[PDB]
Amino acid sequence: VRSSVHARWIVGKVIGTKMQKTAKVRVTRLVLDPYLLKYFNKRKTYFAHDALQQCTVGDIVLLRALPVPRAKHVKHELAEIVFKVGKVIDPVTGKPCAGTTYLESPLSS
Amino acid sequence: LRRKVQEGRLRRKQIKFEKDLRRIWLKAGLKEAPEGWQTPKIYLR
Amino acid sequence: NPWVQIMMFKNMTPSPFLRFYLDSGEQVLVDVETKSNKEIMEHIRKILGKNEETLREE
Amino acid sequence: ATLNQMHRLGPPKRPPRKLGPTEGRPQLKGVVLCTFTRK
Amino acid sequence: ELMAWNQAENRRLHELRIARLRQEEREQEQRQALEQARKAEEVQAWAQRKE
Amino acid sequence: DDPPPSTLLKDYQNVPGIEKVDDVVKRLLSLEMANKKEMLKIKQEQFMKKIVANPEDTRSLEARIIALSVKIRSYEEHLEKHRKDKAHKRYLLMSIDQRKKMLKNLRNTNYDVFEKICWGLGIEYTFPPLYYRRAHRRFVTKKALCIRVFQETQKLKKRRR
RNA sequence: ACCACGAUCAAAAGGGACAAGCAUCAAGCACGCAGCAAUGCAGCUCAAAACGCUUAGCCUAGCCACACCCCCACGGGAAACAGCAGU
Numbered sequence: 435v436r437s438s439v440h441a442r443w444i445v446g447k448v449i450g451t452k453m454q455k456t457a458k459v460r461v462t463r464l465v466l467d468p469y470l471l472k473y474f475n476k477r478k479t480y481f482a483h484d485a486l487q488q489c490t491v492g493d494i495v496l497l498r499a500l501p502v503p504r505a506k507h508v509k510h511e512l513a514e515i516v517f518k519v520g521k522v523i524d525p526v527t528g529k530p531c532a533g534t535t536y537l538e539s540p541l542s543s
Numbered sequence: 544l545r546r547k548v549q550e551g552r553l554r555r556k557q558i559k560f561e562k563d564l565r566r567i568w569l570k571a572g573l574k575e576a577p578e579g580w581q582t583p584k585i586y587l588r
Numbered sequence: 589n590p591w592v593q594i595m596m597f598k599n600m601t602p603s604p605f606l607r608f609y610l611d612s613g614e615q616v617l618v619d620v621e622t623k624s625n626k627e628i629m630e631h632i633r634k635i636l637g638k639n640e641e642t643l644r645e646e
Numbered sequence: 647a648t649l650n651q652m653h654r655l656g657p658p659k660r661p662p663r664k665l666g667p668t669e670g671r672p673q674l675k676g677v678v679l680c681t682f683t684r685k
Numbered sequence: 686e687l688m689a690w691n692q693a694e695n696r697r698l699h700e701l702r703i704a705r706l707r708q709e710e711r712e713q714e715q716r717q718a719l720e721q722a723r724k725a726e727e728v729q730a731w732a733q734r735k736e
Numbered sequence: 737d738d739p740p741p742s743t744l745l746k747d748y749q750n751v752p753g754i755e756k757v758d759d760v761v762k763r764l765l766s767l768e769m770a771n772k773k774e775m776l777k778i779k780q781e782q783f784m785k786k787i788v789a790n791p792e793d794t795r796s797l798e799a800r801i802i803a804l805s806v807k808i809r810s811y812e813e814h815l816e817k818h819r820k821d822k823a824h825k826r827y828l829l830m831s832i833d834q835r836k837k838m839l840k841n842l843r844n845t846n847y848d849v850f851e852k853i854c855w856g857l858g859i860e861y862t863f864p865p866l867y868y869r870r871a872h873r874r875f876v877t878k879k880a881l882c883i884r885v886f887q888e889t890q891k892l893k894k895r896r897r
Numbered sequence: 898a899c900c901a902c903g904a905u906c907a908a909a910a911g912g913g914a915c916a917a918g919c920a921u922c923a924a925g926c927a928c929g930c931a932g933c934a935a936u937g938c939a940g941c942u943c944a945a946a947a948c949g950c951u952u953a954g955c956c957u958a959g960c961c962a963c964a965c966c967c968c969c970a971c972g973g974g975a976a977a978c979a980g981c982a983g984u
């Protein structure tokens with residue numbers, strides 16, 4: 435009722451930043467193979483409005499649907515950056531991390 | 544004789560390539576080829 | 589849950605966790621480190637799963 | 647083949663069946679041009 | 686209330702994590718002390734042979 | 737730039753009283769009287785001191801990138817003179833690919849160290865092409881014509897409006 | 898309802914989903930974005946199959962498409978049973 439865009443909330447990876455104020459994002463969903471009964475990743479490209487140009491190629495972002503499309507292919511906007519590429523903050527402990535190791539120890543605070 | 548057939552086929556390939564290239568700029572609206580454009584002969588040494 | 593987007597990530601944080609995004613914009617974080625897969629299933633069912641009464645009504 | 651390869655290739659694609667001398671029809675009408683015998 | 690309970694469980698697990706991290710920190714401190722002792726002996730011997 | 741030939745070897749740079757020795761001993765224990773590998777070791781040590789937070793940790797990804805970059809420079813210097821050495825060309829190409837893989841991992845994990853490594857080693861990180869296909873003559877000519885035709889279409893539209 | 902409040906039904910428009918074979922159809926050639934606009938950027942799709950050729954009414958309480966042909970029908974060909982019976 436609040437939007438005409440089908441995909442309301444979607445998480446994706448930024449794969450392009452060559453458009454002005456627009457981020458090209460790759461979104462994967464799990465689709466069942468009817469014959470093999472195994473789930474495979476299916477990819478779809480979304481253009482997300484990024485007014486401040488804070489998105490970098492490789493970061494994981496959350497996209498929220500616009501009330502109406504602002505362009506032919508731009509139907510979403512950047513709600514937040516879930517994982518900045520190479521600058522991940524462990525949501526569980528709130529500490530910076532590099533892969534599977536703590537850059538700052540949780541005990542440090 | 545296979546030389547004559549092969550060179551005729553190469554000529555026809557070049558003609559087809561030129562025809563496709565012409566189709567593109569004709570559809571784009573340009574009456575003539577791009578200014579200074581000349582189709583190279585890519586299928587002949 | 590065919591219409592729910594499920595996405596997986598590997599070796600990006602020191603600990604494993606789940607995050608659920610809701611239509612209102614609320615986010616629910618579930619730490620799963622030191623838990624068994626049954627415990628994770630039961631926890632997510634409890635916090636965000638339709639109870640058996642609602643399913644029977646449906 | 648692995649499961650990934652089977653998913654990529656998809657279900658087997660049986661080639662279309664070959665039409666025979668009758669072109670997939672029970673019978674055909676014809677006009678006799680010449681009669682002979684073969685060995 | 687379900688969200689509140691989930692947050693409470695997260696805090697409980699966080700406290701358990703802090704305890705585990707403290708234990709591991711102490712144990713690793715001791716192990717690092719022993720390994721550094723071996724390293725210091727090796728460095729001393731190597732420096733002496735160079736001299 | 738290479739270390740000066742007067743610099744001491746990595747193994748004889750912290751010996752006590754190494755500065756109180758004769759000039760002949762200094763020459764004998766310098767890079768001048770050694771092979772290229774000791775010079776490469778000195779280069780690696782200098783890069784580690786300049787870049788990484790813990791120069792003693794040769795186990796980190798940044799240390800491995802520094803070591804492989806020094807090796808890549810050595811292979812390039814070899815191939816400048818040895819232009820027909822196919823084995824060393826292969827080694828250089830594999831080393832470049834491996835360094836790219838390590839740089840990609842570093843970018844994904846630690847962006848600050850990635851930036852520091854890229855600046856220190858003069859490396860320009862490049863994203864891989866999306867498609868791998870031959871750029872044969874027909875395709876190249878056709879793409880050139882399409883770019884041109886777009887340009888005159890733009891000019892004509894600007895004139896129209 | 899018919900004083901409308903609104904229900905039911907359902908177009909146009911926006912978002913998503915949606916047949917088969919051929920990759921010896923592998924590149925399409927303007928197919929994107931930003932700005933109130935002027936205009937600026939050079940982008941967009943694609944081997945996870947774009948673009949293209951060929952085949953077929955479909956997912957059947959039924960649905961879609963067509964109504965002699967030129968997709969359309971101002972106009973032209975020309976004079977219409979793919980309504981029932983019938984030739």
Ligand SMILES: NC(=O)c1ccc[n+]([C@@H]2O[C@H](COP(=O)([O-])OP(=O)(O)OC[C@H]3O[C@@H](n4cnc5c(N)ncnc54)[C@H](O)[C@@H]3O)[C@@H](O)[C@H]2O)c1
Binds near residue numbers: 866867868869870944
């Ligand atoms: N075609 C590509 O450019 C490309 C790009 C990324 C990934 N891939 C992956 O490579 C695998 C092979 O795909 P295909 O059967 O359609 O190619 P293919 O063997 O049928 O050859 C067609 C084109 O794809 C290229 N190609 C072939 N193998 C590739 C590979 N491993 N990586 C990149 N390019 C490759 C070839 O250079 C050729 O230009 C697939 O799993 C695909 O996902 C292919």
Ligand SMILES: [K+]
Binds near residue numbers: 968
């Ligand atoms: K018609």
Ligand SMILES: [Mg+2]
């Ligand atoms: Mg409609």
Ligand SMILES: [Mg+2]
Binds near residue numbers: 921
């Ligand atoms: Mg053929």
Ligand SMILES: [Mg+2]
């Ligand atoms: Mg192939």
Ligand SMILES: [Mg+2]
Binds near residue numbers: 953
């Ligand atoms: Mg038909």
Ligand SMILES: [Mg+2]
């Ligand atoms: Mg009609």
Ligand SMILES: [Mg+2]
Binds near residue numbers: 978
């Ligand atoms: Mg009739």
Ligand SMILES: [Mg+2]
């Ligand atoms: Mg009729």
